[PDB]
Amino acid sequence: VVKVRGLPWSCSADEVQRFFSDCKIQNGAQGIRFIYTREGRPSGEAFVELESEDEVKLALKKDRETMGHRYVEVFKSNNVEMDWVLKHNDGFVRLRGLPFGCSKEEIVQFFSGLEIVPNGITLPVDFQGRSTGEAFVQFASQEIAEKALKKHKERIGHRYIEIFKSSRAEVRTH
């Protein structure tokens, strides 16, 4: 059990196997289990199933290896962590592809109508410190969040802010 982060949303199961060629992935391609959202799309974070305990060190070795044009975070995990995953009531919204220096003030001004819960915007950072380009948003109600989803690609600066219906589980994993 080796948790992965920063993987692309348009990647294949063989791409992570080719990325982790040094390691012998248990249960072939089935072992490289992706973590999906409530919408169904892949999150960007995966759950790799390393066969041997010695291969875990070989897996963790590529902690900041460049998969094309981005850094991939690699971290050790427990089998219990993999079991507790929710993919398939909640007022969460997965925001994706945001301007570089995008502020919480910019995001609140964007959804000027739909109410956000206190400190709703939970904008996460990469291991280096920079913003991931994605964000979260806990609205006051699920019905409020549903309305937010209607603006699924409005321009913020010069970016179609892709909005997806997420959950608290995805927010806790980030």
Swiss-Prot record:
<comment type="subunit">
    <text>Part of a ternary complex containing FUBP2, PTBP1, PTBP2 and HNRNPH1. Identified in the spliceosome C complex. Interacts with IGF2BP1. Interacts with CUGBP1; the interaction is RNA-dependent. Interacts with MBNL1; the interaction in RNA-independent.</text>
</comment>
<feature type="modified residue" description="Phosphoserine">
    <location>
        <position position="43"/>
    </location>
</feature>
<feature type="cross-link" description="Glycyl lysine isopeptide (Lys-Gly) (interchain with G-Cter in SUMO2)">
    <location>
        <position position="24"/>
    </location>
</feature>
<feature type="modified residue" description="Phosphoserine">
    <location>
        <position position="52"/>
    </location>
</feature>
<feature type="domain" description="RRM 2">
    <location>
        <begin position="91"/>
        <end position="168"/>
    </location>
</feature>
<protein>
    <recommendedName>
        <fullName>Heterogeneous nuclear ribonucleoprotein H</fullName>
    </recommendedName>
</protein>
<feature type="modified residue" description="Phosphoserine">
    <location>
        <position position="12"/>
    </location>
</feature>
<feature type="domain" description="RRM 1">
    <location>
        <begin position="1"/>
        <end position="79"/>
    </location>
</feature>
<feature type="cross-link" description="Glycyl lysine isopeptide (Lys-Gly) (interchain with G-Cter in SUMO2)">
    <location>
        <position position="87"/>
    </location>
</feature>
<feature type="cross-link" description="Glycyl lysine isopeptide (Lys-Gly) (interchain with G-Cter in SUMO2)">
    <location>
        <position position="76"/>
    </location>
</feature>
<comment type="function">
    <text>This protein is a component of the heterogeneous nuclear ribonucleoprotein (hnRNP) complexes which provide the substrate for the processing events that pre-mRNAs undergo before becoming functional, translatable mRNAs in the cytoplasm. Mediates pre-mRNA alternative splicing regulation. Inhibits, together with CUGBP1, insulin receptor (IR) pre-mRNA exon 11 inclusion in myoblast. Binds to the IR RNA. Binds poly(RG).</text>
</comment>
